[PDB]
Amino acid sequence: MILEEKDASDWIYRGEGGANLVLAYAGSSPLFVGKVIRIQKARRNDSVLTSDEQHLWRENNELISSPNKEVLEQRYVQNVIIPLLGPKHVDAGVRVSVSKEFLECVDKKVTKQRPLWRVNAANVDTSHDSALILNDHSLFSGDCISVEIKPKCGFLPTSRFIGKENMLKTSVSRFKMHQLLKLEYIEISEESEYDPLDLFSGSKERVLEAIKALYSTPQNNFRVFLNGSLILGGESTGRTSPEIGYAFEDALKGFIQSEDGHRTECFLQLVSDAVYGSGVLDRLLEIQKLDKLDIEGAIHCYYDIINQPCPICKEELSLHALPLDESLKIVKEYLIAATAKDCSIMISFQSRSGDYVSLKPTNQTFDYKVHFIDLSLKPLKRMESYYKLDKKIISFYNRKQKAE
Ligand SMILES: O=P(O)(O)O[C@@H]1[C@@H](OP(=O)(O)O)[C@H](OP(=O)(O)O)[C@H](O)[C@H](OP(=O)(O)O)[C@H]1OP(=O)(O)O
Ligand SMILES: [Zn+2]
Prior knowledge:
metal-binding; binds MYO-inositol-(1,3,4,5,6)-pentakisphosphate; 7-stranded mixed beta sheet; kinase; 6-stranded antiparallel beta sheet; binds zinc ion; 2 domains; Phosphorylase Kinase, domain 1; ATP-binding
C-alpha cells in the first residue's frame, strides 16, 4: 500500500523517456512479479492542470478532477486513448503510493545507470506521493523475446496552411528533417536509416525495409529484450557494429532455430510479419492523422483558445473565424495526435489463439501480443513550443538544400 525505503532494492533500472523513469521488478512479491514501475521526473527546465488546460479537457471531467499527475495519466489513457485504440492493445496502469524516501532512494540507486545528459536534464520528482504500476510486456502473459519500436509520425502533411517557403514539409517526413537538426546539435552520431513512411506504408516489403533499418541504426526507436534484459539498442544508441551484431546473434540462439549467423535475418522477418500481420500500425496512424491541419494551422487556433492576439499572423482570416467550440476540438485533437506520434509499440514473442507468425525457413510458429506503451498527455503550453521547433526544423532543412 505504501512502497518504503526497503522496497527500493527490489526494483531495477529498465530505461526512461522524457517524462518517466521505468524500473522492473526483481523481487518475489506476487503483487509485483511481471510488473514495471513508471515514475515521473522533475524537469529542471520546468496544480495538476493549468486553467487553460482545464477549459480544454472540460468534456472529460474525471480528468480535470485528478488529485495528482499519476491519476491524470491513468485517466487520460483510460478515458481518451482506450476508446480510440481499443482495450486489447492498451493498458492503463494502476496507482500505488510511494514514500519520499523510496523515491529519493530509487533515484540514487539508478544514477550510475542513467545517461549523464538525462541526469543533467531531470531527476525523479521526490515530491510525488504516487506512482504507476503496469504489466511488463517483455514478459508474455518459456523464453520470451520482445521488441520495442518507437515509430514516430508516419504521414505527410497536406494542409492549406503551410507557408510558401515551407513546402518541403510536403515531400519529406518530419523524422527525416529532425535527423538533420539533431546531428547539427550533436544529439546523434549519424543520421538514422529509418523512414516511418515505410513502416506505416501498408506495403509488406517496405515494412521489412523499415525493420532492417531500425536494426541498423536503432537510436531511440528500436529495442530488443530477452526475458526482460536488454539485448539490442540503448537514450539514443549508435549504429549497429559487427561487435553489437554478433552479441545479438549469439543472444538469439535457442529461440530462433536457424544456423549460426542466419538467426538475425529470421528474427527481423519475424518482427516484420508481426507488425504487418497485426495491422496495429494502421490504427495508430488514424490517431496521428488527428493533426488535420499541421502545427502551422493549429497554432492559430491555440492563440484563440488562450484568448491572446495571434503573433503568427502579422500586421488566415479563416481559422480565426471558426467558433471557439471548433477551435478547442482542433487543438484537443492536435494534442491527442501528439500522444500517438510519440508513443512506442511492444511486440512480445513466445514459441507456439489466432495470433501467430510462421517462420518459412525454420518451420517454427511464434505467438505474439502487441501493446501500446509510453502514452503521455501533452501539456497545452507546448503548442507554442511545437511551432517554434517545427520552424527551426524546416528553416534548417531549407538551408541545407539552399546549399545545393
Ligand atoms: O517532439 P519530438 O517529436 O522530437 O518528440 C519528443 C521526443 O524526441 P524524439 O524526437 O522522439 O527524440 C522526446 O524523446 P527524447 O527526449 O528524445 O527521448 C520525448 O519523448 C518528448 O516527449 P515528452 O517530453 O517525453 O512528453 C517528445 O516531445 P513531444 O513532441 O512528444 O512533446
Ligand atoms: Zn493567426
